[PDB]
Design an enzyme around this catalytic site. Sequence first.
Site, PDB file in Angstrom:
ATOM      1  N   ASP F  65       1.140  -1.179  -0.299  1.00  0.00           N
ATOM      2  CA  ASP F  65       0.011   0.070  -0.409  1.00  0.00           C
ATOM      3  C   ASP F  65       1.619   1.129   0.438  1.00  0.00           C
ATOM      4  O   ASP F  65       2.238   1.019   0.546  1.00  0.00           O
ATOM      5  CB  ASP F  65      -0.874  -0.164   1.035  1.00  0.00           C
ATOM      6  CG  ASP F  65      -2.253   0.708   1.183  1.00  0.00           C
ATOM      7  OD1 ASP F  65      -1.663   1.751   0.602  1.00  0.00           O
ATOM      8  OD2 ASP F  65      -2.312   1.057   2.275  1.00  0.00           O
ATOM      9  N   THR F  98      -3.790   4.442  -4.241  1.00  0.00           N
ATOM     10  CA  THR F  98      -2.926   5.382  -2.788  1.00  0.00           C
ATOM     11  C   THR F  98      -2.015   5.190  -3.956  1.00  0.00           C
ATOM     12  O   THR F  98      -0.902   6.645  -3.878  1.00  0.00           O
ATOM     13  CB  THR F  98      -3.032   4.524  -1.712  1.00  0.00           C
ATOM     14  OG1 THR F  98      -4.482   4.726  -1.298  1.00  0.00           O
ATOM     15  CG2 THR F  98      -2.554   5.085  -0.257  1.00  0.00           C
ATOM     16  N   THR F  99      -1.544   4.426  -4.543  1.00  0.00           N
ATOM     17  CA  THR F  99      -0.311   4.638  -5.212  1.00  0.00           C
ATOM     18  C   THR F  99      -0.848   5.033  -6.411  1.00  0.00           C
ATOM     19  O   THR F  99       0.417   6.119  -7.048  1.00  0.00           O
ATOM     20  CB  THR F  99       0.168   2.760  -6.019  1.00  0.00           C
ATOM     21  OG1 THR F  99      -0.126   2.128  -4.904  1.00  0.00           O
ATOM     22  CG2 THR F  99       1.420   3.373  -6.066  1.00  0.00           C
ATOM     23  N   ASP F 404      -8.072  -3.276   1.656  1.00  0.00           N
ATOM     24  CA  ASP F 404      -8.350  -2.498   0.602  1.00  0.00           C
ATOM     25  C   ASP F 404      -9.555  -3.387  -0.190  1.00  0.00           C
ATOM     26  O   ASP F 404     -10.332  -2.221  -0.587  1.00  0.00           O
ATOM     27  CB  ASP F 404      -6.715  -2.006  -0.107  1.00  0.00           C
ATOM     28  CG  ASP F 404      -6.225  -2.178   0.447  1.00  0.00           C
ATOM     29  OD1 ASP F 404      -6.685  -0.953   1.592  1.00  0.00           O
ATOM     30  OD2 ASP F 404      -4.772  -2.081   0.239  1.00  0.00           O
TER      31      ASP F 404
HETATM   32  N1  LIG Z   1      -6.182  -7.186 -13.448  1.00  0.00           N
HETATM   33  C1  LIG Z   1      -5.745  -6.509 -13.596  1.00  0.00           C
HETATM   34  N2  LIG Z   1      -6.003  -6.043 -15.134  1.00  0.00           N
HETATM   35  C2  LIG Z   1      -5.257  -4.644 -15.628  1.00  0.00           C
HETATM   36  N3  LIG Z   1      -5.014  -3.555 -15.069  1.00  0.00           N
HETATM   37  C3  LIG Z   1      -5.097  -4.411 -13.281  1.00  0.00           C
HETATM   38  C4  LIG Z   1      -5.362  -5.750 -13.069  1.00  0.00           C
HETATM   39  N4  LIG Z   1      -5.016  -5.213 -11.271  1.00  0.00           N
HETATM   40  C5  LIG Z   1      -4.715  -4.008 -11.496  1.00  0.00           C
HETATM   41  N5  LIG Z   1      -4.678  -2.813 -12.335  1.00  0.00           N
HETATM   42  C6  LIG Z   1      -4.680  -1.747 -12.491  1.00  0.00           C
HETATM   43  O1  LIG Z   1      -3.191  -1.387 -11.408  1.00  0.00           O
HETATM   44  C7  LIG Z   1      -3.577  -0.245 -10.941  1.00  0.00           C
HETATM   45  C8  LIG Z   1      -3.215   0.163  -9.907  1.00  0.00           C
HETATM   46  O2  LIG Z   1      -4.299  -0.706  -8.761  1.00  0.00           O
HETATM   47  P1  LIG Z   1      -3.579  -1.789  -7.358  1.00  0.00           P
HETATM   48  O3  LIG Z   1      -2.201  -1.694  -7.434  1.00  0.00           O
HETATM   49  O4  LIG Z   1      -4.587  -2.526  -7.004  1.00  0.00           O
HETATM   50  O5  LIG Z   1      -4.165   0.016  -6.200  1.00  0.00           O
HETATM   51  P2  LIG Z   1      -3.421   0.656  -5.389  1.00  0.00           P
HETATM   52  O6  LIG Z   1      -3.048   2.010  -6.893  1.00  0.00           O
HETATM   53  O7  LIG Z   1      -4.405   1.037  -4.387  1.00  0.00           O
HETATM   54  O8  LIG Z   1      -2.260   0.362  -4.772  1.00  0.00           O
HETATM   55  C9  LIG Z   1      -5.036   0.582 -11.128  1.00  0.00           C
HETATM   56  O9  LIG Z   1      -5.213   1.306 -11.364  1.00  0.00           O
HETATM   57  C10 LIG Z   1      -5.438  -0.653 -12.375  1.00  0.00           C
HETATM   58  O10 LIG Z   1      -6.170  -0.166 -13.387  1.00  0.00           O
END
Ligand SMILES: Nc1ncnc2c1ncn2[C@@H]1O[C@H](COP(=O)(O)OP(=O)(O)O)[C@@H](O)[C@H]1O
Lengths: 144, 233, 520, 39, 412, 550, 51
Positions: F65, F98-99, F404
Amino acid sequence: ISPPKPDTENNIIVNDYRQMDKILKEERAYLLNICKKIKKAKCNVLLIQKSILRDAVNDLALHFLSKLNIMVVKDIEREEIEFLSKGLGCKPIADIELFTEDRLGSADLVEEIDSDGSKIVRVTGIRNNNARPTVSVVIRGANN
Amino acid sequence: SLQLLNPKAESLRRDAALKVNVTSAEGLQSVLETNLGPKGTLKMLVDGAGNIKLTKDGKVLLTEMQIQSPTAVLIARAAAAQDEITGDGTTTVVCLVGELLRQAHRFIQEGVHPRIITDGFEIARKESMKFLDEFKISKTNLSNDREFLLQVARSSLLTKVDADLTEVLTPIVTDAVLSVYDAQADNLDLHMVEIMQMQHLSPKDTTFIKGLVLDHGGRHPDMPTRVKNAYVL
Amino acid sequence: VFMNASQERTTGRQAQISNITAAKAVADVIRTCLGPKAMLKMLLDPMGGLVLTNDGHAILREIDVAHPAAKSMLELSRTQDEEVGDGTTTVIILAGEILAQCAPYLIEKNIHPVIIIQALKKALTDALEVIKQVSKPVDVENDAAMKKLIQASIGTKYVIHWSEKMCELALDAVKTVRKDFEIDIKRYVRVEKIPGGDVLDSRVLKGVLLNKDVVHPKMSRHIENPRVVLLDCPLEYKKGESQTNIEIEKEEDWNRILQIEEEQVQLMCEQILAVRPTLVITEKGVSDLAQHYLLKGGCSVLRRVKKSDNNRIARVTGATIVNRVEDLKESDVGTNCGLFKVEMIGDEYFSFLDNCKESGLQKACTIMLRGGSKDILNEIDRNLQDAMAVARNVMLSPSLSPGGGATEMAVSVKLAEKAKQLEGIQQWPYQAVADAMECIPRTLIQNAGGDPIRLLSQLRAKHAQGNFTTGIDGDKGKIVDMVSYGIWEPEVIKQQSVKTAIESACLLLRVDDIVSGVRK
Amino acid sequence: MGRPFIIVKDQGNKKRQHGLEAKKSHILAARSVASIIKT
Amino acid sequence: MREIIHISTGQCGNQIGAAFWETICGEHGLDFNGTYHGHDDIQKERLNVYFNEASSGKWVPRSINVDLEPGTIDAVRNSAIGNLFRPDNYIFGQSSAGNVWAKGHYTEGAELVDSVMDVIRREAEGCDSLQGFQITHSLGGGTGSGMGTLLISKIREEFPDRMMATFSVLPSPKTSDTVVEPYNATLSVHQLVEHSDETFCIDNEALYDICQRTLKLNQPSYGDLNNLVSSVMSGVTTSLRYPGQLNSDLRKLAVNLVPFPRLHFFMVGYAPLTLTVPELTQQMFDAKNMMAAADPRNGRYLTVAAFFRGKVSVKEVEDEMHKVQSKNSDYNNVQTAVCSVAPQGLDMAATFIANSTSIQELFKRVGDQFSAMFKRKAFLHWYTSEGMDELEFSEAESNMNDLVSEYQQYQE
Amino acid sequence: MSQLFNNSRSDTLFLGGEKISGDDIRNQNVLATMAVANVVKSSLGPVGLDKMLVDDIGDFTVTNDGATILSLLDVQHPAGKILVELAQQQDREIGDGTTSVVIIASELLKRANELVKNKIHPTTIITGFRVALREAIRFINEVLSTSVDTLGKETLINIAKTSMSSKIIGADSDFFSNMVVDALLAVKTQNSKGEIKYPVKAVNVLKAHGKSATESLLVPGYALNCTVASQAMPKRIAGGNVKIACLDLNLQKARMAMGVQINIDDPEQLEQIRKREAGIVLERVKKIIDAGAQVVLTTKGIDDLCLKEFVEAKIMGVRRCKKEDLRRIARATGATLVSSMSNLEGEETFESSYLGLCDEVVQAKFSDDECILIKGTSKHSSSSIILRGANDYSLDEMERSLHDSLSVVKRTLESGNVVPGGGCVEAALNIYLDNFATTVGSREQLAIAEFAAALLIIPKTLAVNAAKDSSELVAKLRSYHAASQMAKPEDVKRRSYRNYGLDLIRGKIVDEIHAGVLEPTISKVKSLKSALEACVAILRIDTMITVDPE
Amino acid sequence: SLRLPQNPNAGLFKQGYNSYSNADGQIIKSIAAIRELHQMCLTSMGPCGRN
Ligand SMILES: Nc1ncnc2c1ncn2[C@@H]1O[C@H](COP(=O)(O)OP(=O)(O)O)[C@@H](O)[C@H]1O
Ligand SMILES: Nc1nc2c(ncn2[C@@H]2O[C@H](COP(=O)(O)OP(=O)(O)OP(=O)(O)O)[C@@H](O)[C@H]2O)c(=O)[nH]1
Ligand SMILES: Nc1ncnc2c1ncn2[C@@H]1O[C@H](COP(=O)(O)OP(=O)(O)O)[C@@H](O)[C@H]1O
Ligand SMILES: [Mg+2]
Ligand SMILES: [Mg+2]
Ligand SMILES: [Mg+2]
């Protein structure tokens, strides 16, 4: 609202055992009869200031206030008491002998609303005989 | 494998761990080798100030001199634990572990495995337990032979002290042990037999008292000193 | 400057290289601590004690590594010990190999660390299938097979020579703690130690073993049918909770205050004598006066007994934990006590409590250990935890997997055969799972002194044709089937080894960078 | 990037100036020299 | 009553006891040889509280110093202050507790405690007025903590009523490097509360702050710390060895400062840490002079008791109390005890001991370390091996929940 | 990038640190932003990988996170503290993105600093972003999609997989997606006059390292981590309709109130006072034992004096616990949390209405731990999550990851409208804003053009984390999206493109509807606004003034 | 059990001499350590190599 403990030092002495039993009973009654007189004036929301030298509202008193559907809010700053009385039109109450219906305010919906971790108790609608109303505006943003 | 993990550490393996256990064993054996037997040498221990305490017991030597080696602390607990319940055989345990390691280490250098070597010690130990049944001899306690108890008492006392102290202190033990045997035949050592310190004329003047001696007396002068028939309460 | 970081950021490929080398280094410390011919390990803690053992869990407790990737490998032994209690070195030695075999690919063929994880779950799913098929059930009530099942783990320890006694010692202890599903727990298994004595005369005895003696000399040292009653409270007058301050006006009050101190202890003692117990075990201390009239009825008083030793007495004697003495009845009094006797040992006194032996609450017991020294006791005590841990899995799961590496080798063969039909990008990490599963027999051959080149080649040739129970004899170093060899282990230990080892690799493979010295 | 960031030798003793405020010290430094010899 | 024995256990115990005797002997006057070169009745007429008059007036203190590390006892003995203590008193046995409550305690109670009960018996039989025992232990170490717990228990059994005062030194979170300090300090209090009658809390971490702030010694040495601990001890004991009636005698101290039984812990306060009674008033109650890590202003005083010394009247102190009560009302509590003699070196000091809800901070801390940093069952095998089980640890954390609760219950 | 430190000035004397001005401040602020942006750039998306941070005591934390990794990174610089507190504001409000919000703010400050060097004022730059964002939120409303013609809980399952990804448990998303959706439907409550707000911290997390993450058991009910008071009590209560009594009362031995000092002249009263003390406690228990409370719950602890009657009456005791967990037990079982037992009349009593109801209660052993598992609640349903892993550090990673995942599905049910993920929103807003402001012309076309390029950093960051050809995907993304926006309304195929984009596993363009990649609309709403205010706070800074500590 | 016996062949070759034999793990220590410089010449290989 707290157990009796007045200004001059008060040393309580227990001579017999019935008395231990009684002291407890009498207290569960000093809080009850004062809360019973709040029901007589049908006051629905209470606001307590910052208490010094003792707790503001006893935990034993919260059971009587929570079952009768009364919102309790403590730890309010002293300078804001002029703000609440001027806005809501409610005169303060320093003693139950002066606690009457005419000195209390009015509101349509006193509500604590929560926004993603921010607790807010906002009062909707004010009506009173007051030539000096009040206004309040919150601030939201990213960081302090 | 340990240096990249821990920034500071020490590691011995596959030749130094064997040399350490044998070298520490031969080193600790040489300390208690001279004490074993009747004509052995005495050993004093003066720690900090210069407190003096003299004895030939290996437990007192081990449980008073601090030791840093990891092998000898196991020999210290082994020599101490065997003596704490039995009261005899302290240096014998050190000599066996002191000798059995060096006597096996020559064959480890020849290339024999440690597992099958220790397998031979265990099956050889079971043969000694079977040999104890045939080697021992039965003795009936109903005879109440006082000469047999005198000879047993001189076995340990001759090892620690000389003949002058053994002859005068031997019947002190025999008179105390003669009262231990009874119809119930329940042995009681700690409650019955005690030791008390008293700075007096000499060690040779040790005498046997059939009753309980106390380290206190009458505080007031007028209270009686000697009493003929005293009923305790 | 900027925030407390960026000293030397190990980034890119070299960071994962140090983790595979660090994870491999943990297994190399205890590489020789596996198999029947395993070597012992003496570790020196900084406090002053010593730990003599060969169990990988007890070794890795005392070690300390200043590296974050190796510490995750350190915690896997606590996963195995506090789940079953056997095969902790098997968990550490297998994972090292899994991280190591997957490394070639990570370093060179550039397969991203997520595609390896997807390959391992299908290998994990297939590993449980073949481990379920290779295992054969076994009857739980057969005491002849249960003794051979318990001594499978004892064979890799020092007390294999006393295996005829340890299986009888462990089997009687497990059935005592076993509740009539079939849930048991080792918290009541008393690990009390007695330095010295011979292992042959050491035996389990039904009941408890205290370290203390009676207080007064006139107490009966031999009772035929003891009646135990547990007490929590002080049996002596106590100060009391509130601010008290008695104020004395007359001269006849102070002697009255000291007289009621004598009468209150009489009142609590007299109501204890309504049931007339023989042994009164108090949790807290005892007074010199109350004990005196406990004597005027025939009881026996002891010193303060810690709580733990009273909860075992409650299940042995059938009594209940009692604090209020006014509510003492005849139903809650312990009964059916076998014998009472006190032996003389130079260390301390020891009071014995035997049971009559003749559903209800589960019975407790104390296992007597008569070792050679202090380290021999702690060595043998961990063997009982490793031996009694085997007895729980056969009751919870009647399945029984073959030992001697035959189970893990069966995983190696089926994953290797199925890797050809799994054509795609997942084929290279899927085939590398078999390369590590064939190492846990390779370690046995190295400790036995044989050549693992021709033995493993002879193993795979006979494993497909001969049978699924083929394995390596650790003592002789020849191929001997597990059916004739007569040594078997539970299947639950094989599941935790495969699950914990693969799940550990999925965590560590996702590590990108290492940054040390941020804050507390 | 690491904590060291060096391009030229002895960066601690060498210090730059820039902007309007840097030129402000130059003319005001000339006033101190001019004011001495003004009398 | 007339006399009180003084047990000292552990390396910290022996050091603090040696410093304490170094202070006491010079206070009412005895060369380290035992001879009395003092002037006159005042210093001699209550010397029987802690010294045994022997024939020939070779006074000898009644102290039992014990340790499982021959070395500490030895050092003290070979040093100065080595003629006073009788040679037989020292009881010292190998190996080392090893900085473990469990091990050290059980193993050597099994042996050293027997020898100690033996010494505590006959030497004391020698008096006609036991009043109680003063133990100086370190809460966090091995020998001292374990043995202390065992001994306290053993003594209480052989001497029911006899009061029991302790001066345990609480551990320093920052400067106590050993990791298993909290996990011992917790098991020690488990039994300190059930038995003791009055105890004083001294924290090395707090001692460092006062050493470096007021004294300004660049690096505290255990010596400095010991000297400060010694001064407070000396004041509390003068409350005892000087003829006086204000808190005359131990039991009185206890009655006066203990509102209810399960609250033994006191916060020492001493000044003039390096004069007029009004000047020392501020120094006693300054939040920085406390030898306890927890802040007392955030907390709540329950029973105050100030021990002055040197030249001070009744009214100097009474007027001061009247002035002070008036301003710190939110924080009627008062107890004064004027003495006549003066500190060695300084004319007038004032020791301060008040029960305070603020101790619950110093226990919420220790409980936090004990639980959170041993939810992971860390460094526990060292204790389970000795023989004691984990149910005992659960009981130990449970009883601190209780302590904290109490202080919270007396509405902080 | 800054070298040759500013000279100490004699004409401007301010106490404390020296003053520094010019473009070096905005260069240092951007340099401070890259110090934190490069940390979180690698751990983005499924292909992204995270790092470890030690706590200088042997302990460490492997964190995915952005709020957690920045919380432990105590940034001494002032500009970095804005983004640190923004992530703490982001995860508490929405729990998603958040990222990305830190990465969006870093790319904005990059190009904003480049625009200031291009000699346009920051006030015009900020006006360009606000008019662009007002059109962006208007465009987000256009691309909404209402869930319709979906079989069962499939829309809640596949949307959880997007949040479940980028973690260690993304491979097991097929197993955890069912129980996560079933958990929030179990704690459905109506509050605030009809507002159905699903809540969390209502679902629980128990750290039990053991078997595996695949075999995580969904216990349909409430779970509590507490040790048994007395070991002689029964660990399994048989029979249905088990009554649960929730209390806050203290059952420890009573002591009378402070201001009470007992003083008696008669010696014989000591028996009686003592008795009354214990007695008040026993009466207090004697009424609830007769009520038939099979399992009592309390917050303050119970001493051994009252544990006798529970062992004799076969009642389960409970030791210290948190204050918040007992509130939800009372809501599920139907009990009422009593701070102090009393009655409106002049006599104490205990009513039967305060008791809860549940079907079964049992103390299950999670391989070293005592946990009271309650199941089959009557008034309101409940749920708990049994997390399992290899070691405790993975369990800590599973805690915040589920937090999350629970938060994303929580906001999903608040608003039925959803938006696709996988950079399609950023790719569409790029081309949409490039077409915008062509009629405006003069000055704001360059500011909004660089703003449109700032949103493309997310599909570029996901590509390089996969170690693949990034520009090959960017050529397919933007071009396809453009060909969709320009198109006639009447063109099915082209319109569809507006719906899809980047894939990180197989490396080709596939449909998000069949793949299952989906996000809530609320996750993007108020995310760019927080990044906008984050950019405004640093971009308006000209000079930096530092006062040394006293 | 605090200080080791310090390897009693310390009377032999001085402290500056370090032995890294096999069985202890020399091959594992070497083949690996040199993988860092192996990647140096590997990255600088080919027409698109990095100087
Ligand atoms: N299976 C997937 N296929 C395509 N894009 C994905 C997938 N999983 C996550 N993403 C992309 O990765 C980005 C960040 O996801 P995540 O790391 O879960 O959230 P955060 O940025 O809060 O850590 C999201 O904007 C999403 O569009
Ligand atoms: N206040 C104070 N504390 C000390 C002093 N010397 C040691 N300590 C404390 O002693 C503690 C550790 O010592 P102990 O636990 O007494 O050592 P020990 O267990 O008796 O030593 P062994 O029996 O040999 O293991 C540490 O927490 C120190 O804070 C001192 O001079 N003053
Ligand atoms: N007599 C034997 N011959 C060959 N292999 C064995 C023998 N005993 C145990 N093993 C192997 O050693 C492994 C670990 O067994 P054991 O030593 O009991 O557990 P641990 O590794 O916890 O000490 C098992 O997987 C088994 O295959
Ligand atoms: Mg002999
Ligand atoms: Mg095993
Ligand atoms: Mg996310």
